[PDB]
């Protein structure tokens, strides 16, 4: 094997190894025979009678340190509970650390799921398993995930000659999509079915290669029966659909959108491209060099002590969206505004208006809460799209409003949105028609101010939901200026 | 040996009552699952017995045979099994939620059933005999399944023979329900000298028409030294049946006494202040001299009436159950002081030329029950009738009146909303009261009369604006404009 494991990298990359160690990636697998303290959950007294197994039966825990994610699975000792002798049983009871309680799949009591043939392509390095090309192959792996070489490729040649043998740094979403997806392998099992993890002739996905050569990811189109995505396209299945969701978002096409536009320059790339966003202090990135949109790596830091403990965000949840979704350089009377989302919600637009933050802004609600609704169990949707309460009702799905407002009905909450939006859509139609009609007076100061007031509300794109009273105040002031 | 004849005996003469009682969860509380296998709830198929550590064949009864408002179903195993005495039954260690649709397992009691008759069944069956320290010899037995007619009306043997000559008990007294809907110690004791958890004396169980205190010392805030049963606010903490101890601490329990202490008391008043008057059938008169009881359980809950709500047997819908009494309907006139305009304040219908201004929460479907009966003890609505302020929610780690509907807001945020509203309204009320006292000489004027009434709506409402903040402000603003 060419995989040397994480300990090899601590000497030369001391800080990165330390920061990686604190991440839940870095604590994903614990050997509980070597480290009994790491085995979570209560096995004391009668618990074994309920569980139908005991502490001594367990070899590993999956999710060794909880972060944002909290449910911990157990892998039993090799060969036990009905699995082949060269594989391990994933157990039928998981521990919810955050809730502090066992969760038992009753139908699988006694019958462990084979770990390596079902799961471990997303969990370990250098995995070999029997395929229909190699039915004979022995089941084995090199090292525990989620580790350096899974995101940077094998380290053997690099540890010998660091300057001469380069590792892969990928800002590509595929670097994360190799695990943060569902899909079928190109390879097949001895029985002719696909694996649930990336796998081809050559084995697992390797950073620097094309994911499609190893893995066909699930999609809204491929999910004929609506088992994985809701009709809104948000993830339904709790299990890891961030990448398939992300592919449907503007973030994925952020750089392409910039290229298609006539006014594109190098200034723009900071908000539209990962390479530019993640360029270190002196470096230049140019329209020709940039290839990628707003990928996972823009929002998530794989090993940085400044990142948040849960979900490794590069900035706090309050800033993670506003960093790009602002109009900071461009709120001036006479100029049209682009995406003033930060400013609209917090109510800081200048132009002589005092600060009028929305009620929800003052109550601590932020972009993430409405635009990343928990549509798949406890997981925040990466579609970035609001689930309207009507669709919450129509599909029996969680929505952007009802989790914070369980006292209100979905029809009540939808009526709030429609009342706000119909009012603001109307005023926007009037003021736009008045601005077009009086185009000849464009040079006047009154018109310039009305154009900008109108543009804040329009370009915001929420039709008032972000800050209803400010939207009204602005479009009222726009019409006063227009006579 | 027993005077208890069971419910079937009453069906012939009281056909409608028996039918209505049959649909109540009282009437379906115990099912024999050997005689009726369909009645056994929960999943025993496949591997479930390996998890549960028992099987369907081990079960004799189900407690809570029909779910209503209450949803968790318990199982009683076959006689003598799982570690209990040979003359008693094991209450099992796994309950079925049904509302959730899932098992709930007390892991510590796997293998060890709790003895049903000596621990529980005084609240569940008629004619219960168990060994006491007076009669250690007595054999454990019972007459009939609860929750049945004779538990609320007394034994039926003599009455079925001679209906007109041998009267049954109808009680509007809260004790009629408090005999089960409480926690406390029996006056009787076990062979070991401990009290039973159900009413029991020398003569056995509580009988309707007798005084509960002769059989049972109910728990109280004062008796609960260690705060295991009540929160510091006095609301129930323990999920298990504390409606009666809660009810005793409320004005509803003293509603008739309050009326008697007042000088202007008349027979008109009794409809809102007394059970006998409230429940008086078409024709009957109730007078200050006849009425003995306040606003008891029986005012709000109907024991067998097809017009009641299916869950909790409410006599009126949750939207009307409080407003029926908490209104000022006959008394909003300029110049007169208003009394308890709670309905009117919340819905914003006060007349006096003002258009309708219902509060935001009124328009959003919030009602008295939601704020005043917060679920402080698991899924059970508190009968203390008192709001739990979010500060006390935070300070004690208890559910509060606001956070369940507003989980997005912090408890400090929600308390600040209340204090902002209340401090504003308390201030305006202090100004307008001082101005009304000061200009007492101008009392005959139309302006003053209207300001007195506006002030009185907001003051007598007693919420200091929480019921409808904007209306409170509008009224006290209008009161001060009139006082210029
Ligand atoms: C350079 C000077 C720039 C050009 C040319 C463009 N941008 Fe941006 N951008 C940003 C956000 C958050 C959005 C989404 C806004 C929304 O959906 O409301 C955009 C969008 C665009 C678009 C249109 C795509 C669409 O309709 O959604 C174009 C053509 C475009 N951008 C070109 C963020 C930022 C940003 C953050 C600080 C900067 C500096 C720029 N964009 C700069 C440019
Ligand atoms: C497998 C080979 C993975 C790769 C490559 C990446 N991730 Fe991952 N991730 C993986 C697992 C099995 C888990 C669950 C264990 C856990 O840490 O909770 C995760 C978890 C995350 C999380 C959640 C972190 C938390 O606070 O709980 C995030 C935010 C995350 N992963 C992001 C992420 C990014 C941005 C990646 C590439 C740049 C990436 N992951 C790669 C498995 C694998
Ligand atoms: C910002 C523009 C983001 C991009 C691009 C991606 N993610 Fe993300 N992620 C983001 C936030 C703000 C959060 C927190 C959500 C919350 O309400 O807490 C997350 C969370 C995750 C998680 C944890 C899942 C959960 O607990 O809800 C994972 C595993 C994750 N993100 C992975 C991930 C991957 C693989 C991405 C590229 C496909 C990706 N994210 C993009 C913000 C952003
Ligand atoms: C820059 C580094 C960004 C961060 C951080 C976030 N967003 Fe973004 N977003 C950005 C661009 C350039 C675009 C336009 C992309 C395009 O090709 O048109 C977007 C777009 C969105 C949208 C529009 C809907 C869509 O196209 O999918 C939404 C709703 C959105 N962004 C939300 C959003 C949220 C909630 C964020 C924080 C977690 C966030 N974005 C971060 C640039 C950047
Ligand atoms: C709910 C309390 C929200 C908060 C907080 C924020 N947003 Fe929002 N947003 C919300 C709604 C209901 C809508 C309207 C969607 C519709 O289909 O009518 C929006 C709209 C946007 C958009 C434009 C949507 C689009 O054209 O695709 C964007 C880009 C957007 N929102 C981003 C955004 C950001 C960055 C936020 C915080 C700074 C933010 N929103 C807050 C609901 C809510
Ligand atoms: C928490 C994560 C929330 C989400 C998501 C949404 N709302 Fe909200 N909202 C929240 C708080 C804490 C508050 C303040 C206290 C309270 O609960 O009232 C609000 C406030 C509102 C209001 C009143 C606004 C006003 O102008 O007076 C409305 C009408 C409202 N919220 C509606 C609403 C809708 C329609 C949402 C999704 C589209 C939504 N909220 C999201 C907390 C949170
Ligand atoms: C308490 C849990 C009761 C059970 C069980 C049953 N009854 Fe009842 N009954 C009870 C009360 C408190 C009252 C008076 C107040 C009220 O809600 O009506 C009654 C009234 C009756 C009457 C009076 C005649 C009438 O107007 O309907 C009868 C004849 C009567 N109850 C009979 C009865 C029978 C036959 C029951 C079981 C088969 C039964 N009741 C159950 C309290 C409770
Ligand atoms: C006739 C064959 C009866 C049987 C059997 C039972 N009841 Fe009865 N009951 C009967 C009559 C004729 C009357 C009074 C006159 C009338 O208007 O019907 C009653 C009255 C009651 C009452 C009211 C209190 C009283 O006046 O005694 C109650 C609470 C009552 N009955 C209850 C009751 C119960 C619980 C029975 C069986 C367990 C039962 N009755 C049998 C006629 C007959
Ligand atoms: C025991 C001898 C009881 C007496 C007397 C009364 N109640 Fe009761 N009640 C009892 C039990 C064991 C249960 C639980 C089973 C069930 O019905 O859920 C109840 C339940 C209620 C309920 C809830 C009904 C529901 O929908 O779930 C109510 C509202 C109720 N009980 C009221 C009540 C009243 C008003 C009583 C006297 C007038 C009364 N009960 C007597 C046990 C016993
Ligand atoms: C009459 C048939 C009533 C019904 C139905 C309800 N209430 Fe009541 N309430 C009533 C009276 C006569 C009184 C005054 C009692 C006294 O002795 O002075 C009350 C009092 C209250 C109070 C005040 C606080 C207290 O003393 O406990 C509250 C908060 C209260 N009532 C609330 C309330 C609610 C929430 C109701 C429906 C669930 C309800 N009441 C019904 C008369 C009547
Ligand atoms: C319902 C339609 C009622 C009628 C008729 C009468 N009263 Fe009442 N009363 C009612 C309620 C709901 C309450 C409690 C509300 C509250 O303000 O807390 C009361 C309270 C009283 C009180 C106590 C005053 C107080 O502490 O606030 C008294 C002294 C009182 N009631 C007397 C009374 C008299 C004399 C009546 C007729 C002449 C009368 N009430 C009728 C409900 C109703
Ligand atoms: C009105 C003035 C009431 C009086 C007096 C009593 N109860 Fe009540 N109860 C009332 C309401 C409106 C409700 C529904 C609460 C909800 O939000 O769902 C109840 C409920 C109960 C229940 C069911 C418990 C639950 O589901 O939360 C029981 C068992 C019950 N009530 C019993 C009970 C007893 C024994 C009473 C007198 C001692 C009593 N209640 C008085 C309204 C009123
Ligand atoms: C919350 C959304 C509430 C609703 C709905 C209703 N009430 Fe209320 N009430 C509420 C508060 C926060 C307060 C103030 C309590 C304090 O200590 O400051 C009140 C007050 C009352 C009172 C006075 C109680 C007392 O002084 O002891 C009464 C009598 C009362 N409320 C009754 C009541 C009724 C009948 C309701 C519906 C018709 C109602 N309230 C709604 C909170 C809320
Ligand atoms: C549901 C059973 C609720 C309870 C109990 C309480 N509130 Fe509420 N509230 C609820 C809804 C559905 C709404 C409208 C939509 C929304 O969630 O905002 C509200 C509204 C409010 C508001 C804003 C109203 C305004 O004046 O503009 C506030 C400030 C508010 N609620 C506070 C509040 C407090 C302090 C509570 C207990 C003392 C409380 N609410 C109870 C739903 C429910
Ligand atoms: Cl109301
Ligand atoms: Mg609200």
Author numbering:
A (entry chain B): 43 to 525
B (entry chain A): 42 to 525
Which sentences did the original study use to describe this structure?
The three-dimensional (3D) structure of OcwA was determined to 2.2-Å resolution by X-ray crystallography. OcwA is composed by a globular heme domain and a three-helix bundle at the C terminus. These three long α-helices are reminiscent of the pentaheme NrfA (nitrite reductase) family of proteins and of the octaheme cytochromes hydroxylamine oxidoreductase (HAO) and sulfite reductase MccA. The crystal structure of OcwA shows that this protein forms a dimer, as observed experimentally by gel filtration. It spans about 180 by 81 by 45 Å but presents only limited contact (<2% of the total surface area) at the interface between monomers involving two regions. While the first contact area is formed by the base, but not the remainder, of the three-helix bundle, the second is made by a small alpha helix and a neighboring loop from an additional beta-sheet domain (amino acids 75 to 156) within the globular heme domain. The hemes in OcwA present three distinct coordination environments, as follows: hemes 1, 3, 4, 6, 7, and 8 (numbered according to the position of the CXXCH binding motif in the polypeptide sequence, where X is any amino acid) are bishistidine coordinated. Heme 9 features histidine-methionine coordination, whereas hemes 2 and 5 have histidine as a proximal ligand and an open coordination site at the distal position, thus being responsible for the EPR signal with a g value of 6. These two hemes, located at opposite ends of the nine-heme arrangement, have an almost identical environment, with a histidine serving as proximal iron ligand and a His-His motif (HH 281/282 at heme 2 and HH 380/381 at heme 5) situated above the distal face of the heme, which in both cases forms a solvent-exposed pocket. The organization of the hemes within OcwA, although vaguely reminiscent of the “staggered-cross” design of the structurally characterized outer membrane MHCs, clearly follows a different design that is similar to that of the NrfA family of proteins, with alternating parallel and perpendicular diheme packing motifs.
In this paper, we describe the structural and functional properties of the nonaheme cytochrome OcwA, which is the terminal reductase of this organism. Surface-exposed OcwA is proposed to be the terminal reductase in T. potens JR extracellular electron transfer pathway, where it bridges the contact between bacterial metabolism and electrodes in MFC. We show that, in addition to solid electron acceptors, OcwA can also reduce soluble electron shuttles and oxyanions. Finally, rather than being a truncated member of the MtrC/OmcA/UndA protein family lacking one heme, OcwA is structurally related to NrfA, cytochrome c554, and MccA, which are key proteins in the nitrogen and sulfur cycles.
